[model samples]
Target: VLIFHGKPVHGAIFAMDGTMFDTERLRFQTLQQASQELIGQEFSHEYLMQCLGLSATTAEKLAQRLYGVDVPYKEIRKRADEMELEHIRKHGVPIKKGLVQVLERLRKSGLRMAVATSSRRAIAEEYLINANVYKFFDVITCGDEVEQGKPHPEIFLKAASQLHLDANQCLMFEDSENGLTSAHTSKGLTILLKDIKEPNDEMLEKAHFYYDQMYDFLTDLDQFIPVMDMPEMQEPFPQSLNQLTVGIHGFGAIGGGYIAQILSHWDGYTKPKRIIASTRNSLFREAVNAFGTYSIRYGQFSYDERIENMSIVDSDNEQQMLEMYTHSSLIALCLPEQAIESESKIIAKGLYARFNSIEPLTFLIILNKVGAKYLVMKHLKEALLELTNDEDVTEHILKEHYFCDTVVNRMVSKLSNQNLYRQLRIKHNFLEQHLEDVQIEIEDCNKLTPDQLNQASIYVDNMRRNFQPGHILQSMDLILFHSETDMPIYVEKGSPLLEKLRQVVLVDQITDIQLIKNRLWNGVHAMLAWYASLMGYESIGVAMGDHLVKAFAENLIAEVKQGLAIVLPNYAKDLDRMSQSFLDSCEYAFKDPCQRVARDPLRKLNHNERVMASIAVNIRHDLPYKNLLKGAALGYAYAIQFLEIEETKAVEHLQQQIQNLDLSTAQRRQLEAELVQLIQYLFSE
Candidate 1:
């Protein structure tokens, strides 16, 4: 009578009643018809337990002894059968929790299976067949086959014989006291899995093992397989994370710069433990690991703050990524849309590992695109399907984890501004004091040729690496980034990291807000970048400071406001205030280099994208599209001037797009003709 956890066994013998199907109540309710109606009293639950597992003759004899000789016992028995059969046929068989899952595991692992029940062969077969689990059993031994029912070892012994295993080699599962005694007496490993009756201390001690339901046993079965190889845990899980450990999947501009900064300085209800951030960029990983900290600038202000308690793991290191995945309470995927596709397989691998450990996380997807979580989840699903070769694993992820799509309003810079370095030179010795000695001159940044710019960049970059010691941002002249605002949206209402995250501005409904941002703020932002680049502006702040750039921006803002009013008519009167808010944020944050903002013009100009899409909105409402079309033309100019698309090629493509725009015809023809003149004048000698 040594107590031990159950291990893998050769064969399994299960009682058909409560251990597998939830039919014990059916038996109890059906028997009530006989006692309450025919016998003029209800049968006690104690009395029903006595007759439930006995042979028909034995059951009838016990009933006769209890009631009287002429109590119409046979009529009562027939009525019981009729009522039970009607109920079973109407509702089919109700299975116990985790019955199929437990059964499927045992059968797949090559266990010989049997069903031993006190029910007669006909009804037992009907119940098994109705539950569709009849296929699972190799042996079925019932009450009618034995002269003596439960409380005798004959039924279990016969089931073992039929299963081609000795009695001791089989694991017998039973819910009834009678069945448990019978099975235990047969010298098999008896386990109690109950429904209605809680086994008393005597019964619990008699059984070799116990579980409240089949699913409880199935959960312990995982421990039988040693799925994870961790070192030591002899204590119970406290179920509280004192400090939140988070991971960042991408270590690019926002992920490494912004999120890590926020996480390190976290002083929320849940304090910070550490952050494990992953990066594909080899140099970034090397630099952060070597320096042990990164730098960020706030509104031209610089600080060499510690990236305290942070470990930057390379994305290629799956083991490290797995460690990051399992231990993290939350993981932020701060990646661009295209990077998500490439990162899916790796992220999915981490997800699968986390799934095995029974860990869940809130995946904060920081992307500019709408429905970003769906895109990431779809990618992760495809990766998991390939990795696990099971679709149900996909189902588990959707159940256990949360993926939130965010609309980020903050404008962050890519550390490409020269004024920042010029300002920094006054603080640090990475560059010369006078403008004459400053090899990377702040004044001549826009005028520098590509080759000269490359030389200047390499000179200053190498000098800063050597000069700043371990810090990335050594001077106004060193590694630093700027974020204009602090508004980020996530589904963090009931999130595990809800109060723990200090990133700010979490809400549920972001669709309309995202739409407004996309069609208005983002649209105008793209136009300004493209136009500023065409006019030889170095940075966003400088371009915005210019009267010509300001006039063009004002014209486009008016157009975007009008377009948004047409689309988001509910926010009709307050549209100007919204535009003004964006303008104020941008004015403070617009120190980003024009090249950084202007690089992806074609993506911004794609159908249903920024400038062109806003243009179409104006076109649809029959409003003046002059400024919007001019924005589209400037986008084309950036493509021709810097992107090096042949003028004729760009012109023809613009012509085709103008013709195919989702708007009326006359203006498009007029627009096309007008654009041809602008293209001619833009490339004019």
Candidate 2:
């Protein structure tokens, strides 16, 4: 049972000559004789290898290159082909060892088989029939039938098409470099059979699996495909923490501080060897290179510590990025939501370059937006296909690797105060105290000067620990606040955790949790921010301190809570607790700016986003949405205000979205009138 893309392997495609038969030597002998007789010289071994898996057209070109443009290349090839066939007819075709056994096993297992060969139809059919293996193939594709041949993926693709199967769902076997290249390009699970002519390093690296003989694969077929009673966890867990490397795509506040902080204190032996961070910022790269480390300041305070065992690389440096990707066991995409589309291709290309040796690398999207994992994976798959121009490789990556989305509840802000930055500098006096026991073992990082170390600081306001038990505020005297449940929640497609991930909560559905966070937390927060901005307040903490703003937030949360409980009764009890905790966190050291929270009103007003989605749920349940509607009205007013203030064409986009809402004429008209009135009222002096 060879499982791929959550399904069993449906078919297999085999390259005929050297893969299934030992006839390449005979064909080479005939070619050598023909070339010597026609050109008065022996053909080079390298030249013969080049022509091994090529079609007639491609081989003719190679022949011309070998024996000069004036040589009778066509006649030489024709004579060689005839001579080879004649010799094979008299002395039976040399079938490869274990060819019958492997076919019988695959047939018994009910796997569909096809023959994809570079030989012409009549010749390939006759050769297979003579060897008595033609009956085993469900479909047979020949070079003459396709526009291109081996090394072009046409023949294999044609065979897969004929089999009524996807190219990625098929396994391909080949011996020649050109054949292997074709199979790999087709994106199938490629197995290279080492024959008398072994493949070069490049060809060998392209194959997913390689073997000395055909029989060698039979015993360990499960490694490539599925077997009847294979055990799970084929490989044991690593013994040391240093065996793993974590690659972070972005090095901003969340990527470089929050997520990095969690990994820095990973439990057991799962600690990573190093954090390889990619950034486009030359200043950040230069700073990390100079200091040999970066700082993550926890809590609202300015106590700083250097994070050792990290390396910074330029994201634009493809070679360096590829090397980092190849070695990382886990990758965290902490990039902004908009960067997913543009940076996906760069990431996919790096993964493709190291596709063969990479294990089941796990990718987590740590973006705050909902359904971030889905969007990231969508663009990632698209990029993988575009980079390789092969659906097979894309499918392989999709099936083998894990791309997951996570909910990060930690609130972090970057410190801009130069005085505090200088005060928190790592003096030699503080080095021994701040360094973790693990960091003491790593000696690669440069010794930082007191002045050079404290360039910037990232401030954490309220690290929500509601998901974990005990409401743990701090651990190991480090102000790294994680979820109360001691783990972050995740919504995934397949097995939530194929491997153990420390401090992670994998749930079958995140709808209820997402609703609680979006509506009760983010939705209420945005409403308060918009309301406060109108009152000429700049800070969320100050706004929350105001009784009017606090009352509005409480009312919005209560309305959304009732609406959510009806839709998700299973989480009703938790919703009450979560709502109270969220309100409390909003007031705790809440220095977040109203302008920052109220920004991006267009995204906030999305039909399925926080505010609108809550309103939709309330409307569906026939529940009161007065507070929610007020919030939506405020969001729309902000949208229009920002559109005009920024001098952008975004108002037209908002107008288009409002027009496209699927509502009754009366409902639409009333909603539009309310939005217009709110916008005019908010802007009026």
Candidate 3:
């Protein structure tokens, strides 16, 4: 055993002969052929099989004892050896199933691996090298490395010593009766491979465990094992009531970073008896284990671990995690705005089922829409009403829980997988566990300025709490992957928690006047990112570095501020200050090409937030005219064409259909009028 941080790291030892390779099969066939060749004696299949997994000397003795006559042991041995060599040279070695997978798993786990066999070095090397597994073994000890091979500890002992591993900490795999005895003699945890031809009671007794084949061993490996031994896991139980159960769905940019933030800083609140974080992978658990010692900087307060913590669920599929919905009071929906319709349908059902009782529960949907909470509630009510045959679940949820809306502002620095993997490897001194995604959510909503708000929209969170009595908002990160923010809005059935959240997190009408300022700042930057890409600039950094492009961004923000000043006068001043800060940040942004600018203009312009908002803004009569209608109309045209292209590619029989209406011209005009009405409903005339 190797001790690290006061914990033991176990080692494993495996036999390379008949157990790993099908050498025993060849050996038996060669012996059978040799018996007939040397003494004109026909040996039964069972008799030859019994000689397998045994050394040459032992097989020779067994052959003599069984026959009870001189069978020319030297000639038989020579002939058998020649046949075995020819068979191996032509066919190569046949390895048992599950060997490669098991070895890879063990190596990944950082287990000290060693091979101990009764075969000679050349034989062992031949098999190991041919299998392409020679480098994985830390130690390889053969029969020649020790004096007595079978029924002796010399081979195993040398293997353990070479690996610098203690015998008791090692697990050994062995076949044949003598090999089992030899492995056990070294005081290792012996796993006996059952050989039908060699089931001697004494040898079986020496094994600490028994298995039929390596496949069986691998399958049973996970069974009867402690839950803690499972990789990337969390507890399945709940701990407290006041615990803020935070569930992060789609651990991409914003969701992942929020987890890191909570683990790193808000440990006091997050580690409490009730703080539960649900993630898609074991990465959150491992990160908490490694960085839970640190604290997160939440404004002026630095929080540390306050109570014992537990992670209740680990999965990527949203439906699977709904099983623990009732357990969470502070539910955060970090998905994209476009996916909100479908995701809301599932989430509503889960919330309805989990919180079936009249007790209050809070649900927060941090998305991109201005009044996203109302849309979610509308969809959620529709789904719940359909599910429970009662629309009151929606009304009940609204009354009991606090679903506030807000906006989040933080530069979640992006990192590639290669860079992140290298970072974790170097940091942990080993390959990272549960680090499949590299996205993170940075938490700092106070960074938005006035210029960003006009082109961009801002809120406390997606709930839009400050908008109206039913609207709420909470500040959270907008996840690129989810196309939404990590802002959650919740309301228990007939609870007054909404007001309580307002006191702590919401930006009320009289307070947080700078909220709209930040929104404008974000809006302008998004526009700049979109426009920069259209100009063929490689990234947001490059676009912002150009004098003309940077001036256009500033000018756009200035125009947005002039417009916002009419409605949000008090916040306009703050927006002015943020505009200057934006200029400063952009000046320093030249160093980061992939960030602080648009990497791809076409892609950025096509994003749902950009396109949808542009479309909505052009139709809305409240804002100043920016001729954004042309861009919005172009985007819609592109979307129609793109969808047509996709349909053509995906469907074999799909073809454009021409139709002739049977209706009169007046009827056709009426139908066209209805169509215009429908379009107007989506975008007010």
Candidate 4:
């Protein structure tokens, strides 16, 4: 019955005393009485409340702190314990209102229950049995049973282990700050009950739900439970995709080229009824609206197809764009890394407007940058706070909606001609061959006319120009576009598209893959580009033709792979394959310019970025990385040449950055010495 994202709530863990029973006041009064009688002094309400939700030993220590070191702590605690038991025995334990009703409903729903309490086992059992709620729990884990008590998470973790459930699957109920801390630490879905003690803002922030009374939780029970539970969606899905509207924030290369290809050539699954695209380019918007569709020409093998049913909106029109986003089932953030900050606010506003809707919208972020999902999520959280001024809405967005991270493997770029607005030609030879080899059963391919096949174009939307003279000569051996191997777009493990999308590589180690790409592929690519530029080479293909440059590239790859192996030993095969793939592509086909690859020198030279990131890893592991150091030196040389800066000025700028980096004294000196040696060697020549 517990149904958010169709994941059933396995069980419930409850804190005893104040949370489930009105026994805190009685216990507090009993302790106060004991302190007065034993020490001939009265304890304040504030002092008494401080001992709440703590083990007997811990509370005794606090009592000792309150009184002098000369005070007899054991005698006072013994007297307090006896008095509390006697009172409970005489008057019976008082259960909190709505406790029985909530327990009964949960029991009827077949959810197992457990008690995780700081109270002693015998006393906790006695209170529960007296209140007639002891029959409800499957297990009871007391404070003394755990090595570490409340606020340590040991007790909650022990209870979860005893119940045979993950901490995340259990719903925990708590009243005190210590209990709240314990539950939150366990990563459970926590509900804070405002009974004898109301939690402060910090404590409340940790809770998933908060209520003034127990009955308030029961009042909206159905809101947290499933109505008609269906079997969980599994692999090789039985049902067709239906009634889902998809929105694309950016309609450039990734949006119009890659995403458009998938939608246009959808095989059997129900395609989105409408695809709403937001673009700031006036020319692109005008072209899409005029033609009602755009053509994407793909590959060296060359297949031209047109995508229709696309509605382009001016991104500056915030109200209109928000309306489109609110109605979307999924949104693809296809903007550049720099544009994410500004676009996130607009996306958040749209999502906030649809906060109360039945179906939540999923945000699928497709970007090359590492930790893009976290960045977008952080920005969205800030934007939600700015819009509604409520942390609850931010929490709701996190729990309900999916913020999926994806790795786009296919290389896509815009065809810059203004006249080719209606048609976007993509040189993706690899994708064309992959689709052909897979024999992916598409619904539209067989329906093409003979003329369409002859022209290598289907007139569904716009037109596609074949590979021009410049394009053909430059990319004759680009392996990514022309290789037979399937290019995989990796999404996080629990992504909604894992089973639905055909060519997606779903993985739990998304960050690992990102690091591999950055360190091994991107790092090497940049290193080669910088070194090649210094050697007066124009393109990677031409540089690889030089024996010394090729040898340097090979050695650099080996060093990086070795460094990566230290951190990610299990991904050896994957690393080897990707390294080889990049080498093959660079050697044979991709005639990419050194200047283009080495663009944005400042960002690329960041301490934690591609080149420096690999160097740090190598240095940390004590791995041999002389070639990488040479690459770094070459990069600095290229920067000096490209920026047309004096040697003194360049050295000053680099020295400033070197000081800012978080490196040990020894490491910093080593780096500075290496820089000096390299600068002298390069400039002196």
How many clashes in each candidate? Answer: 2, 12, 81, 6
- Model 4 C-alpha lDDT per residue in residues 415-493, reported as the tens digit of each score: 5654353223333344355446531122345877666655454332123222222233232221111221214556777
Candidate 1 lDDT over 1-685, as tens digits, reads 1122644478889998888888778878877866688888887777787865565666777877877776676777778888888988897788785576567656655779999988889989999998878887998999889877788999999999999998888889888888889999999998888767777997899988888878678666544422211111121111111335789988776776567655554422123456888877665566556545556555533334345556789888979999988888778898888887889999888888887875468778878777877888888888888889987778888678877777666556655446544644554453333323434333356778878878887888788656645342443223545554343333435454444344444555666667777767878888888878878877777787778888878788888899888887766754675676577666644446778777777667765777776777787888777878778778888988898878787767776676667867887877787777776676673
Q: Between the candidate structures 2 and 3, which one is better when assessed by TM-score?
A: 2
At residue 383, give the lDDT of candidate 4.
83
Taking all chains together, each candidate's TM-score versus the true structure is: 0.46, 0.47, 0.37, 0.47
Query: All candidates' lDDT scores?
Result: 0.72, 0.70, 0.53, 0.73
Candidate 1 is scored at a TM of 0.46
Off-target runs (Cα >4 Å) in candidate 3 are 1-10, 104-113, 137-139, 144-148, 152-154, 161-165, 193-212, 215-685
lDDT of 2: 0.70
Instruction: Write candidate 2's Cα lDDT for 184-288 as tens digits.
Output: 999888889997676789988998878898867754553443322211111222223333577889877677766665555433223565888888877566656
Tens-digit lDDT track for model 3 on 202-286?
Answer: 8667776777877677556533221121111121211211223545544445444444343222211112223444444454344
Q: What TM value does model 3 have?
A: 0.37
Clashes of 3: 81
Clashing pairs in 4: 299-428, 429-481, 430-481, 430-482, 477-589, 478-589
